[PDB]
Subunit: 330 residues, 4 copies
């Protein structure tokens, strides 16, 4: 009859509370349990047979790699159950773009996986959480959502977990993608206008079942007068790969090039990303001789997205050439 | 008759060269002298009397604090002269947003200061540098441009140097501002639609003539599983202030808070900015108890922008409350 | 103590109702009275002394010129009262951009005039109306809002009534301006980043007290294979001016030029606007010889905005040169 | 070896000329022949074997239905030939979005069809036409471009001809799509990030080979105080379908509804589109009782886009329900 959708709660602002109804930016995250969030949206029963499960209760800015894994493996078990048609995960918006992309790479299933959260706490007036959840379930319950990879439903849109990013603060249209939304969801119906072109879920070469722990990967910011300090400190403390968030097209200061070459020889992967994330992408060999130095470009992925792909990829390969190929297909 | 405008060349892609006409992104920067540039745009003579001056020949990704000081002082000199009505500066786009903001804060003059660059080298077909420069001189020669603060002229727009940022890679519309452009420049004419509302140039409490050196300020990136490693390494190497490029609304991981509190007690200013730079701003006391920890909020300025203001501001005060007032007025 | 703000209700979706809480796009407009909308936001009393007045109850798509006048004159009376500090008007979003601009041109007062509405009806889950109203009052009560012209507060932003336009359907970030927002409002506080540069309110040469009725002005759309039919039919039925919503830069088909020249000679003002409204503006004499034909360009104003300015301007002048000047200053 | 690509010239600004190099917006279109164009881009020879063919020399604002048919049939001819791998068409930008969508609907071939223009004439400094054409041929020669539908290559992007629209005037980034670009083209290479999800070319139920003429379809604009004048005049002059460019979600004024009901009974199809074209879409039965009145909703297509689909669709059916299914699939 109706689809069986499971909601995995992880905390976030969607489960947070404020001092008054006028508090739409000042609140305490992860205060409400999954059962209460379901009860707050009575109409949910009209969309699917839904049951909630509290996986964790955290503010997403304080998420760890073990949390991601615990979440990834749990999702995998649910997707393996013939009694589960769709999966919705409520997650704080600060690192939601990171978790959504992670799942897109390691969940080998065509069942819909939808990640959702809200910019305003549930206690604020005109809170965006109720409709976001409703739309999340509506999409997870839809047959047309299968095989589209991980999705995020906020601001009446259906966004790809791959490249959607929290780009605007405070406002409910916080999440944007340089390549646009895949569609929209209005009054329960899903409307598609685009399809993903990058490898995901079922057609991914990675699998959360084979992963026991993630390699350490960190990010260093680049700007005027930057020195190699942050890069070396991160590498010396364990990083197996470093995401260079350079100016413009992954540009690197001449004062930092040496440390990067040295680090590369030492076994540390160097991936060039940038802090120009509204559009475009980093081109190989353009700003730096990547072939000569044996570095890797993150294509269009912003720093935090790059880190996620790098971590997953390195559980299978440590070959810079294979890494580049992966950054060009995922 | 015609206004007297001086062009201060600093390098960049606008002065760059590519291997072929088909090379629009792969090139070598700072290869052309200011004389060659001016020459390439004969029509300039119609707008005003122009003379070039090569201050330096660098790629902006490799700019240093001494280069800023050197450029800022030279600008203050030409502005004081009565034989100068407007000033145009060619600068690489990678850190143009940083130099543009710096000058907006320290040049105590109402004469037009216009910063311009090009996304494509002059050797590329359909290069954008010729028209950008022409519009730069057109704007710097216009009386209506006085008292507007530092301006940047690219993509037929008149952008404010304060908040214009390189947001899109590769494409010519690379520079955007969350609050929009101030106006446009078409066929030599300037059209205004908005006015700046933040303190700048003449009404700035800072003066390049009173600044001999700039305090060291660095930036740490925040993301899932981030540790206090980068923050401490940076402080250990001299940083007098640290820009925290947090997720969401300047959010800080619970794993890093203790290190940030210790660093503050030690005298390191802590400024919360973010990597959500398309819109909105970081609110004081929302995600963290800034009052209690004596931290500072960067308002709407992205990481590299906040670093510029922090530096300048710290040549005059080290009082966090005064620092906060400064971040709310400039 | 507190400011006295008056809320003039005109109907709209903000006062509309849906069949269920899941109905966020399908609803019946203008069903709720001003008193109920106030009672729905208890926190309002914390911002100012507020009183409501139901001016009319309509769906804004069915608004008439007499409605605008009735609204304009009413606002004028309130602004004349020493007992009124701010004015907030709830208005359907479909033609809100039209009414907000109208008021910006004819209300000779520096007191804050804020127009607001909502994309979702008050009965939908996560309805945006409550916070929008709250923010509308917060802004109207602020002293810093004076002298900024008419403002619109939705999606946590402070937009200029001049050029903000409903650009996106369904979503709460529906209103955008090619020149960006003037600021934002969060948890009661107003944050400014830009200032208007065009003439408005107190510095306008128009006055709602001198206007008894508006001249008829209509709009004709332009596209491939368009004929002069719509243009002539509108003129023959009373239009004193016609807004040409052309392709690109106010371009006109060669098959329509004649009718336009003929109409001009007959006394009908011809104003070239366009259906390219995300940015840029229409340039005089670029696509058509406006000087020779004696036509007028709408600069950056979209068709419906152009119609509003044209109507107001023609109550003072019928000189095409003065009309052009007006389109370049307002 | 190299692919065989044919360039069909139709005119436009790309083939235009300005009075001076400083003229980027003021110019005269369709002055250059296809041979002169190809010649101006020597590098083309490296991408493939190209031959030009001047089909017509017009300004796209003056295009007619016979020009569309003539262009569509010529395209179907070249596609059938085995001596043609890809097809490039230079077209004025003003109505390029219309021709691009038309071809996407009627060309039953998987060979790449790329439409390109230029915002600046070739006589302007920093003209954009040279690189745009180069990228057009680069994309039309690429095997990965097959089965993607009609494409448009400007601003280093690969846009879908279905929903790409000229949204910004003057600037080179004029063309945008609510659902984002499909990919980008840099230094001869194509990078894909999204795939089309709507029916096109090979899977289209329409075929230019079976279309001798197109039914007349016109567009009426809606705004404050609009009357049924334009709607009726248009129907009286032959319109078989009327595109209603309403405010908001295709909203219709209560003053116009009766005329629209009478026109429908008389056999005129009524299609509700809107002038809110940055995002979202018009929902069936939301603002008006479409089922009851037997009207049709344009979904996300702007007015000029909806007109193209209505025309094409009406060469096969006049059943409103089938028309609606068509507007939801293409
Ligand atoms: C609250 C606002 O969206 C987000 C929190 N910091 C979180 O991500 O838990
Ligand atoms: C070339 C593209 O603008 C940019 C530079 N690398 C520079 O900043 O010099
Ligand atoms: C409802 C949605 O915002 C808008 C109505 N049609 C109105 O403007 O009254
Ligand atoms: C010139 C700017 O692209 C455009 C044209 N008027 C045309 O469509 O021919």
């Amino acid at each position: 009859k109706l689809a069986n959708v499971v909601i995995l709660a992880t905390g976030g602002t969607i489960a947070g509370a404020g001092a008054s109804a006028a508090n739409s930016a000042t609140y305490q995250a992860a205060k409400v349990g999954v059962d209460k969030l379901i009860a707050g949206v009575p109409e949910l029963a009209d969309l699917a047979n839904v049951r909630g499960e509290q996986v964790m209760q955290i503010a997403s800015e304080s998420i760890t790699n073990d949390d991601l894994l615990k979440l990834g493996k749990r999702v995998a078990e649910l997707a393996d159950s013939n009694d589960v048609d769709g999966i919705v995960i409520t997650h704080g918006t600060d690192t939601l773009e990171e978790t959504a992309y992670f799942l897109n790479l390691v969940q080998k299933t065509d069942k819909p996986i939808v990640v959702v959260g809200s910019m305003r706490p549930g206690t604020a007036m005109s809170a965006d959480g109720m409709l976001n959840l409703y739309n999340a379930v509506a999409v997870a319950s839809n047959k047309d959502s299968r095989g589209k990879g991980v999705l995020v439903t906020m601001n009446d849109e259906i966004q790809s977990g791959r490249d959607v990013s929290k780009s605007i603060n405070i406002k409910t249209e916080a999440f944007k993608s340089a390549w646009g939304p895949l569609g929209m969801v209005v009054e329960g119906k899903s409307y598609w206008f685009r399809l993903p072109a990058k490898r995901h879920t079922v057609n991914s070469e990675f699998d959360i079942k084979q992963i026991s722990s993630l390699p350490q990967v960190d990010i260093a910011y680049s700007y005027g007068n930057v020195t190699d300090t942050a890069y070396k400190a991160l590498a010396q403390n364990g990083a197996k790969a470093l995401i260079h968030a350079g100016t413009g097209n992954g540009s690197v200061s001449s004062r930092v090039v040496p440390a990067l070459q040295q680090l590369r020889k030492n076994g540390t992967q160097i991936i060039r990303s940038s802090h120009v994330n509204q559009g475009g992408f980093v081109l190989r060999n353009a700003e730096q001789p990547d072939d000569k130095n044996d570095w890797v470009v993150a294509h269009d992925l912003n720093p935090e997205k790059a880190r996620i792909l790098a971590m997953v990829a390195m559980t299978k390969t440590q070959d810079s050439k294979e890494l580049q190929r992966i950054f060009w297909e995922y």
